[PDB]
């Protein structure tokens, strides 16, 4: 589902790199999705904390962004959150 | 107020760069804020389309993110949407 909506995970600028095969196949139905989605920024937060750009390329006009979300070290589940996020970051490199 | 919640607008990666004086002062009460919020990604889109990373720094552990949202030149308001977004991108450079 994740592959169908956004594409295959890869190293190129036109591709995302987040998600193991379980998250890729299940998507929002993934058991641990709410725990990941809590770090996804709201609309106001996204436009408030990110570096935004307007880039016109041969592929078209794009609204670009870059940023970083600080994880609360005083959160009781801080260690599990890191493991789960690292569990999906660049997991496609380990795909068979 | 955008500045109180998400800091001053600036040229650093640590800093957000989006928002003119009106949007900073009014925030979500800005007249055309919904026209901007529509381009913010959903939780699934954010983690599905963005290139995600993790960094452990002296300031803490950070979930880094970057991506590109294609704007539809087909939308009837495409020109107005581009103008609106460009109005707030890097507007801080012209601040008193």
């Amino acid at each position: 589902n994740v592959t169908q909506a956004f594409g295959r995970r890869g190293p190129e600028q036109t591709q995302g790199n987040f998600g193991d095969q379980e998250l890729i196949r299940q998507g929002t139905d993934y058991k641990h999705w709410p725990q990941i989605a809590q770090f996804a920024p709201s609309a106001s937060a996204f436009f408030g904390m990110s570096r935004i750009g307007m880039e016109v390329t041969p592929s078209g006009t794009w609204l670009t962004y870059t940023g970083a979300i600080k994880l609360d070290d005083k959160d009781p589940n801080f260690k599990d959150q890191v493991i789960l996020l690292n569990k999906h970051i660049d997991a496609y490199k380990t795909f068979p | 107020n955008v500045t109180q919640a998400f800091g001053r607008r600036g040229p650093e990666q640590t800093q957000g760069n989006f928002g003119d004086q009106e949007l900073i002062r009014q925030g979500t009460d800005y007249k055309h804020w919904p026209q901007i919020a529509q381009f913010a990604p959903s939780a699934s889109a954010f983690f599905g389309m963005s290139r995600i990373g993790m960094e452990v720094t002296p300031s803490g552990t950070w979930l880094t993110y970057t991506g590109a949202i294609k704007l539809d030149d087909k939308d009837p308001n495409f020109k107005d949407q581009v103008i609106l977004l460009n109005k707030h991108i890097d507007a801080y450079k012209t601040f008193p």
Partner: nanobody, 127 residues
Framework: AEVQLQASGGGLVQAGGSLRLSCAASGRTDSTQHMAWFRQAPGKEREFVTAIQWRGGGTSYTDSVKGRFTISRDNAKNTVYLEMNSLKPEDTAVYYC???????????????????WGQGTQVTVSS
């Protein structure tokens, strides 16, 4: 001249052979946003080959090299590698690595958008 680029890895190989170009960045590498490789064949214009984001690591390629060329960088060191497999006579050219400082998501593909340049490395594919 805040950033210095050191390029190497050129050589002479037969069609189907392999080479690895390297571009090591020194100085204020913190301002680097994109690193790219350009090439110029005899009597032809400078052509974009590949590029990589200095922070996130997203990669870009021109159509003629997709699948055969792979650009990479381990995030901790400031040296980027371009692995060139299945080399063709059309790849014979002088290769140049370059860096820039303006943040963009997509790596620029025109030389004027890059600020720092390395020495040219000659690549020749000979029958």
């Amino acid at each position: 001249a805040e950033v210095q680029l050191q390029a190497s890895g050129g050589g002479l190989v037969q069609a189907g052979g392999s080479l690895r170009l390297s571009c090591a960045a020194s100085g204020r590498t913190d301002s680097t946003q994109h690193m790219a490789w350009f090439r110029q064949a005899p009597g032809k214009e400078r052509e974009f080959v590949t590029a990589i984001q200095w922070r996130g690591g997203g990669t870009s390629y021109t159509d003629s090299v997709k699948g055969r060329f792979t650009i990479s960088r381990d995030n901790a060191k400031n040296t980027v590698y371009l692995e060139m497999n299945s080399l063709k006579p059309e790849d014979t050219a002088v290769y140049y690595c370059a860096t820039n400082t303006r943040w963009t998501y997509f790596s620029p593909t025109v030389p004027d958008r890059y600020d720092y340049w390395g020495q040219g490395t000659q690549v020749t594919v000979s029958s």
